[PDB]
Amino acid sequence: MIQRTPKIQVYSRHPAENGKSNFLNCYVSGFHPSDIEVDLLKNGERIEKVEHSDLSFSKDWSFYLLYYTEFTPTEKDEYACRVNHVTLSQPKIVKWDRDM
């Protein structure tokens, strides 16, 4: 029984410019087993219309998925990814750092 916690990366598709349309991504990888729950949050609120990629996996058998949603960056709004997996005692939140 292997169990591997997800690596989580939150970033935009393009360099973020305030007031310009973009995509926010939450990339979860290196995990096992496959059951996982990912929400995108805006100032702490679940965003409804979040699409995701089909489940696949890497050469090392570890799974990965991309979650994403169209958005417009602004100065004020905080974005984040909340992720739950069997390996996690509590859901993990990772804030979007725009320089990153």
């Binding site: 029984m1 292997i2 169990q3 591997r4 690596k7 990366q9 970033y11 598709r13 360099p15 995509f23 991504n25 990339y27 990888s29 290196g30 096992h32 087993p33 496959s34 059951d35 990629s53 089909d54 489940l55 696949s56 996996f57 058998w61 570890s62 799974f63 991309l66 994403y68 320089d99």
Partner: protein, 276 residues
């Protein structure tokens, strides 16, 4: 043409809390997903996920749907069989992963073929590179191995991987020429953030590149710096391109001593980047 691959990645999961199982498959040419299948779909069919594959006719979709459903059923069965071999409870959820496919060398001829299985995250059974024999991870997989050795499953796999796999790959490379066959080089930049009083972080960025392979390395006066390099996982942009960065903490005032070296098939010559 050169490095190319056609791959299928399938995942069978037992769900004793729902009294059933689930099978999912995706197919990739190189870094580009083109089809999917999911047994939890109502009316489950092989489905297109790239524009270029949709100009295949109904018989392609019919045939692929027959064959991936056939495989889903057998993988349903395999999960039950593996429990028996490992003597596992009926209450645990288990995972069976299957990857197969073909790799075309720089000359476009078949270079490698693969067909292998992982159970609960761990290598179980793998077709050898000769494509004539099988490697088994443990006594359980020895049982599958013996069974497949005596049935000569390797021959059927060798025929598929050398024939249909490569031919299909070549039809797909041609159908999807405009996207699959041109490489997009990275757009790069180097950032500098003082990260302590003592040290300065230099970050070399690559954005908007396809395919996903890329080398980012930091150098001072010729010698590579990977010991103290933080390198994130290459990550998808969502539009077919990728992103990566590598960072290095450097003494303040010594920034110009350091260069980031970028190699990628999209580039005419490797880049030597410097903080500006």
């Amino acid at each position: 043409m050169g490095p190319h691959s056609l791959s299928y990645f399938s995942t069978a999961v037992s769900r004793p809390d729902r009294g059933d199982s689930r099978f999912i498959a995706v197919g990739y040419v190189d870094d580009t997903q083109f089809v999917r299948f999911d047994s939890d779909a109502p009316n489950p069919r092989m489905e297109p996920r790239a524009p270029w594959i949709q100009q295949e006719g109904q018989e392609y979709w019919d045939r692929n749907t027959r064959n991936v459903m056939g495989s889903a059923q057998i993988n349903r069965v395999n999960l039950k069989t593996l429990r028996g071999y490992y003597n596992q409870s009926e209450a645990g959820s288990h995972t069976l992963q299957w990857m197969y496919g073909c790799y075309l060398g720089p000359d476009g001829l078949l270079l490698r073929g693969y067909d292998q299985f992982a159970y609960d995250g761990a290598d179980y059974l793998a077709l050898n590179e000769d494509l004539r024999s099988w490697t088994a991870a443990d006594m359980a997989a020895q049982i599958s191995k013996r069974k497949w050795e005596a049935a000569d499953a390797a021959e059927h796999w060798r025929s598929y991987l050398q024939g249909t796999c490569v031919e299909s790959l070549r039809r797909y490379l041609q159908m999807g020429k405009d996207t699959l066959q041109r490489a997009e080089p990275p757009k790069t930049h180097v950032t500098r953030h003082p990260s302590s009083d003592l040290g300065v972080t230099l970050r070399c960025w690559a954005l908007g590149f396809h395919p996903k392979e890329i080398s980012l390395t930091w150098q001072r006066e010729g010698q590579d710096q990977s010991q103290d390099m933080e390198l994130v996982e290459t990550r998808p942009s969502g539009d077919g391109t990728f992103q990566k960065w590598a960072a290095l903490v450097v003494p303040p005032g010594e920034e110009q001593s350091y260069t980031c070296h970028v190699q990628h098939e999209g580039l005419q010559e490797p880049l030597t980047l410097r903080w500006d």
